[PDB]
Design a binder for this molecule. Structure first.
Ligand code: 0EU
Length: 720
């Protein structure tokens, strides 16, 4: 119709719709639409909720910010710089959005496409802001020298019988004359059958972007993506498909959102079928669809469509700092800090998500039974992979945290059949709760690294009996993956709060890999009054330390009947007949008592495993009560976050100062400005938070600068 407002990109939109995706130039508007929903209702939207520019390569291969009509791209990659207003950043946060244009040479990657990705990614890193990559591509571009394809000739073994084969390919002198100035081929001049021929030894092609230069280009952007993951927030959305380098780019950014019915693949199904010589695979989704990648941790989450993908991106960003040199964004909670937790962990197995997010009340219908974190704030990732562990993000009185919790129910995992292997059939496997398997140790380590790079505090609801130590799980390298937990926690740069909840336990190798001493500056450990911790289970401690001999020694000491029989069996003047009767009765009594005296010993061992011993031995900071634990940990975390902002300011003014020195300094400054009578209030987290907020070093700076300058002249006697 002539009355609506239309651009000239209708054909591109349609082409994108046919491939099951969104035209790249329509993504900015999706973000705006997603931002509005994220905000709520049209009563208090800000003025310019989203402003953006297109990032365009100039003649020198540098990016310039432009405001131009959509669809003007000369390479099959597009980039935007976007500023949007959110609850976390009402005055704006920036991101870089980079995306393949799947309507431009099927989203293949050539030199120009690679250069734009590189430059946009470099710009995200230089400014310290998140890089968002929209993946809809066909991998590295494939070409042939079109100007040679229909001019070459064949030197047959026998021109009257071509199935005998051919000796070489060649160009006639007339043809060589047409292309010798174009740098298209390398030829060797020869004579045969009395005719001059230009024998082909190499085909170069006069057009750029045919072959290996496309692989160099792919490697270039793989390296850049590897680096970006280390420096800034990286997120990808997979829509339609991600192939080859496209698949590696999404993996290297780590945080992957995959649209349902898309695929992440290296080589495709029909290619593999041709190589293997039979119809093995039914579909690319079979190789790299959500049912593979959501189930193995490559995909953090799945969405029904592009729009939910974009919305998901904004939700993830809402937990994260606006850039890599900013504090985590703490918002005003609506869920009160000073409330108890209504859901109570039990000895009986429960879904750990209820403890985090709460749940519908079991009896009082229409009511929510609150969990630990702020209502509605817990959002899980890598859910269907390695289900004995739970990983996600949440808010505690408004503070964004990474979250690790442990499943207590037995897990049923469906392992898919291998289509390439005749006798392989589908299996169901069971994984015991409260255990690290190779898969869940890996998921745990991954999550730790990802959250560290988002700069989040980490909350670990510890509940592990140990690692799976059986032959299969040992063969499958459980040991390698347990070690990554150590590396990950060691490298953590933000506070880590470890809490063993009611009826949870921390034992053996599971304690070891998460102990506070791995990162004494970040990690604090807490145990519920109803928790347990020790090298073994009490049943195991008894097996090693309180065996049959010891159980007998116990009966002798405390069972009246057993005591008498031993004392009767003492007398030497005793006949052979009385001796056989007494020791018969002693064995009878022994057999009646072993089972329960065994339980007594188990309880004896159980009393060594208490939070009480934990505290007395200094392996935890405090014993908590679940109902009031949300409140306590809120203030502890606030305090730790604030003390760290100060402590890092102290170090940029005097880098030499040890961490024990600084702790004493902060305490000293508190005592000066409140008085020695109030020094005990340093142990009060709420009071210290308030004090730091009211009081928000110059002298330290003077001395360290003067020390730096004296050193430089000491080391270099010229200069002055
Ligand atoms: C000799 C005739 N060889 C072939 O027929 N190779 C072919 S047929 C074909 C058809 C469509 C697209 C690509 C290819 C293709 C090709 O060049 N590929 C690149 C190499 C790819 N393989 C790389 C090594 C690993 C491999 C796939 C091979 C295999 C071990 C079978 O399983 C795989 O995943 C397969 C596709």
């Amino acid at each position: 119709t002539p009355y609506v407002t239309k651009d000239l990109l209708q054909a591109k939109r349609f082409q994108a719709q046919t491939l099951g995706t969104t035209y790249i130039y329509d993504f900015p508007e999706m973000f705006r639409q997603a931002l509005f929903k994220l905000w709520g209702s049209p009563d208090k939207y800000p003025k310019d909720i989203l402003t953006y520019t297109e990032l365009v390569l100039d003649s020198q291969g540098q990016l310039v910010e432009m405001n131009r009509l959509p669809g003007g791209n000369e390479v099959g990659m597009v980039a935007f710089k976007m500023r949007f207003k959110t609850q976390e950043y009402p005055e704006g946060r920036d991101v870089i959005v980079i995306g393949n244009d799947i309507t431009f040479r099927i989203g293949s990657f050539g030199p120009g496409e690679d250069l734009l990705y590189l430059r946009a990614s470099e710009m995200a890193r230089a400014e310290g802001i998140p890089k968002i990559y929209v993946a809809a591509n066909s991998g590295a571009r494939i070409g042939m020298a079109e100007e040679i394809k229909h001019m070459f000739h064949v030197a047959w073994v026998d021109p009257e019988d071509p199935h005998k084969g051919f000796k070489y390919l060649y160009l006639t002198p007339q043809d060589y004359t047409r292309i010798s100035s174009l740098n298209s081929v390398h030829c060797k001049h020869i004579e045969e059958g009395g005719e001059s021929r230009y024998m082909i030894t190499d085909i170069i092609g006069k057009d750029d972007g045919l072959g290996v230069e496309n692989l160099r280009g792919s490697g270039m952007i793989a390296g850049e993506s590897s680096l970006a993951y280390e420096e800034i927030v990286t997120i990808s959305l997979v829509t339609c498909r991600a192939i080859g380098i496209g698949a590696y780019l999404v993996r290297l950014g780590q945080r992957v959102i995959q649209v349902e019915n898309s695929h992440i693949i290296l080589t495709g199904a029909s290619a593999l079928n041709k190589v293997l010589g039979r119809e093995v695979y039914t579909s690319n989704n079979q190789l790299g669809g959500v049912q593979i990648m959501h189930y193995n941790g490559v995909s953090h989450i799945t969405v029904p469509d592009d729009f939910e993908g974009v919305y998901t991106i904004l939700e993830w960003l809402s937990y994260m700092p606006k850039d890599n040199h900013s504090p985590v964004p703490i918002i005003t909670p609506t869920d009160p800090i000073d409330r108890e937790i209504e859901f109570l962990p039990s000895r009986a197995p429960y879904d750990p998500r209820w403890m985090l997010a709460g749940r519908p009340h079991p009896t009082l219908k229409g009511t929510w039974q609150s969990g630990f974190f702020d209502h509605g704030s817990f959002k899980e990732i890598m859910a269907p992979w390695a289900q004995t562990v739970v990983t996600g993000r949440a808010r505690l009185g408004g503070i964004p945290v990474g979250v690790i919790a442990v499943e207590t129910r037995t897990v049923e995992v469906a392992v898919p059949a291998d289509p390439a292997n005749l006798d392989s059939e589908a299996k169901i496997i069971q994984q015991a709760g409260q255990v690290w398997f190779p898969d869940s140790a890996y998921k745990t380590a991954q999550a730790i690294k990802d959250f560290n790079r988002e700069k989040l505090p980490l909350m670990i609801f510890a509940n592990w009996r140990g690692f799976s130590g059986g032959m299969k799980d040992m063969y499958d390298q459980v040991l390698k993956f347990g070690a990554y937990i150590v590396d990950g926690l060691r490298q953590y740069k933000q506070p880590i709060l470890i809490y063993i909840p009611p009826y949870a336990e921390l034992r053996g190798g599971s304690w070891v890999v998460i102990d506070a001493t791995i990162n004494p500056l970040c990690i604090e450990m807490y145990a519920d009054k109803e928790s347990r911790g020790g090298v073994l289970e009490p049943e195991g401690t008894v097996e090693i330390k309180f065996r049959k001999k010891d159980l007998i020694k116990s009966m002798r000491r405390i069972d009246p009947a057993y005591k008498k029989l031993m004392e009767q069996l003492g007398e030497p003047d005793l006949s052979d007949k009385d001796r056989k009767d007494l020791e018969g009765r002693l064995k009878a009594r022994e057999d009646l008592l072993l089972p329960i005296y065994h339980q007594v010993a188990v309880q004896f061992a159980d009393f060594h495993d208490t939070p009480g011993r934990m505290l007395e031995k200094g392996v935890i900071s405090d014993i908590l009560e679940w109902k009031t634990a949300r409140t306590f940990l809120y203030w502890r975390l606030r305090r730790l976050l604030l003390e760290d902002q100060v402590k890092q300011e102290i170090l940029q003014a005097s880098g030499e100062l040890s961490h024990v020195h600084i702790q004493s300094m902060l305490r000293r400054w508190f005592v000066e400005t409140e008085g020695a009578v109030k020094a005990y209030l340093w142990d009060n987290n709420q009071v210290v938070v308030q004090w730091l907020e009211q009081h928000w070093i110059t002298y330290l700076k003077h001395d360290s600068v003067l020390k730096t300058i004296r050193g430089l002249v000491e080391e270099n006697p010229e200069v002055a």
